[PDB]
Design a protein around this ligand. Sequence first.
Ligand SMILES: CC1=C(/C=C/C(C)=C/C=C/C(C)=C/C=O)C(C)(C)CCC1
Length: 133
Amino acid sequence: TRDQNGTWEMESNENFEGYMKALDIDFATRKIAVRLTQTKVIDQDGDNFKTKTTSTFRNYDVDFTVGVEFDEYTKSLDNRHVKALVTWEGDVLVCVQKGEKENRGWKQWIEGDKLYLELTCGDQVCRQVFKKK
Ligand SMILES: CC1=C(/C=C/C(C)=C/C=C/C(C)=C/C=O)C(C)(C)CCC1
């Protein structure tokens, strides 16, 4: 399905360390994060997405329309300008973040009552899994 709506609660988080190190996040921000549950809320209506991810540490909030290129300041993360574009490849939601870092983006998809998210930067991949709540 392409319907990614709802409230999603994290059940695993693989190599978030490596992904953050690839983005040049200070050792201490990485220490704080590294581990910590999370809730992602996706409100999607056709191509229009409003997403909230929440942790006890920092929020990162992302709204976009699929197929409409937009400039992203990645505020919560690594302090950067990117040209972000979100598109569909089959039922996989794909974001390419163009700028200094190579191979920067993410891919998100649904299989069952789970949401899967693969965050990439350079040679690094972080894999998250969420359950619908
Ligand atoms: C690095 C980092 C974070 C992660 C940010 C990410 C990976 C956001 C991805 C959002 C997506 C892919 C939304 C798509 O719908 C947090 C949690 C703010 C904690 C502080 C450090």
